[PDB]
Amino acid sequence: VDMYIERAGDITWEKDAEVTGNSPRLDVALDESGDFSLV
Amino acid sequence: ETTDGVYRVMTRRLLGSTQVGVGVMQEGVFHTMWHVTKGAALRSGEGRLDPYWGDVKQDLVSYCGPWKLDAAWDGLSEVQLLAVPPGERAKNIQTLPGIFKTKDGDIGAVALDYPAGTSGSPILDKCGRVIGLYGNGVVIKNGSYVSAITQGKR
Ligand SMILES: N#Cc1ccc(C[C@@H]2NC(=O)Cc3cccc(c3)CNC(=O)[C@@H](CC3CCCCC3)NC(=O)[C@H](NC(=N)N)CCCCNC(=O)[C@H](Cc3cccc(C#N)c3)NC2=O)cc1
CATH class of the missing domain: 2.40.10.120 (Thrombin, subunit H)
Structure with missing residues (x-):
């Protein structure tokens, strides 16, 4: 399998960007496999 | 390279x-x-x-x-997801993070939904520093997604 990378952009903050999405506070757990779950 | x-x-x-x-x-x-x-x-x-x-x-x-x-979200300020979805140009999405509350401390979390191949897109603070990577999270009751702001240790 050929796994490769290609540039997609510069890492910069964008002024006057779109403000979207809520801000949920969630009780979660994390197992040894790296999987989050809701508590 | x-x-x-x-x-x-x-x-x-x-x-x-x-x-x-x-x-x-x-x-x-x-x-x-x-x-x-x-x-x-x-x-x-x-x-x-x-x-x-x-x-x-x-x-x-x-x-x-x-x-x-090693940059860390300050727990207070809005951040930007620099989303790089498959087949689409990189785009900045600004958002106020929620929180994952865990037995081992709190982790900022962003309620933004993108395809699987967007995994690894960086989350930025206002100085452009990468405070974590997007793409490991949970699905809530309405079907939407919340990603941890996953940051490693240096
Ligand atoms: N049980 C519960 C539960 C909790 C956490 C997770 C992990 C999560 N996986 C999924 O989200 C798998 C999934 C479940 C249900 C439905 C889908 C996928 C199909 N949805 C999509 O293909 C896509 C739709 C959007 C809609 C808006 C326009 C763009 C496309 N969305 C997604 O795949 C995820 N969103 C939702 N399910 N709402 C976001 C994915 C972002 C990138 N991250 C991932 O793909 C990771 C990959 C992953 C899998 C297993 C383990 C780890 C680590 N350890 C990482 N997926 C998730 O974080 C699933 C179920």
Whole structure:
């Protein structure tokens, strides 16, 4: 399998960007496999 | 072959490529999420990037050197997801993070929904520093998604 990378952009903050999405506070757990779950 | 920036992580078979993830080149180290590459070596132009460190529980992996990203969300300010979705140009999405509350402390979390291959897109603070990577999270009752702001240790 050929796994490769290609540039997609510069890492910069964008002024006057779109403000979207809520801000949920969630009780979660994390197992040894790296999987989050809701508590 | 290691110039700073955000990169797509692609796989190629006998025909056509698929974007499986995204990652960050900084200080000569490539940073992405473990479930994107499974720690496999990465081709970069004519060169080869080898896995240096990883942790399946954090869902992180670095190439060429140790994890270099150490900026932290301040728990207070809005952030920007620099989303790099498959087949679409990189776009900045500004948002106020929620929180994952865990027995081992709180983790900022962003309620933004993108395809699987967006995994590894960097989350930025106002100075442009990468405070974590997008793409390991939970699905809530209405079907939407919340990603941890996953940051490693330097
Ligand atoms: N049980 C519960 C639970 C909790 C956490 C997770 C992990 C999560 N996986 C999924 O989200 C798998 C999934 C479940 C249900 C439906 C889908 C996928 C199909 N949805 C999509 O293909 C896509 C739709 C959007 C809609 C808006 C326009 C763009 C496309 N969305 C997604 O795949 C995810 N969103 C939702 N399910 N709402 C976001 C994915 C972002 C990138 N991250 C991932 O793909 C990771 C990969 C992963 C899998 C297993 C383990 C780890 C680590 N350890 C990482 N997926 C998730 O974080 C699933 C179920």
